[PDB]
Amino acid sequence: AQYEDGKQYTTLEKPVAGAPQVLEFFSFFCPHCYQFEEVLHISDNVKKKLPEGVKMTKYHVNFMGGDLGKDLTQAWAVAMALGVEDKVTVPLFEGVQKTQTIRSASDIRDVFINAGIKGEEYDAAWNSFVVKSLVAQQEKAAADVQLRGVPAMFVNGKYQLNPQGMDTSNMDVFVQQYADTVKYLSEKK
Structure with missing residues (x-):
């Protein structure tokens, strides 16, 4: 059996009309987080096999601390x-996986300003409409699907x-079976 409803992919009780063909949920606080977007390349590897029509969206979660985890979700919006x-x-x-000093919204700012994104430009971006539009759709992304286990898709x-x-x-099998589930999942309709 290669996917038997609940093995590799279970069905949600609340579908989202307009949802992305591949809603990706990941935070800068998991062990897979890094291994997913830095070593295994499972994120860049699936893109290679993403033909026009497969909307692969990557969103940030706000259920990993409550304090800076929520502002770190704002990070995905203020950074994008x-x-x-x-x-x-x-x-x-590297700050959340080899230090644990990343546990305060003020810390998320230290790293943001480290890239030359002074709080003046960062706050301006958030206060703008485009960054806010990504914040709204962000809190919505996790609020529409609900989200309940990172990484989630x-x-x-x-x-x-x-x-x-x-x-x-x-x-190996994870990256192949995974890439296979998304390949056919594109033909879901």
């Missing part, structure tokens, strides 16, 4: 706004993949 993600992600990814807001328990001894 200035394209400073790649810049503040390195010091943010939702196809067209109707089928969620399930890394719920896959840490055996083959990152």
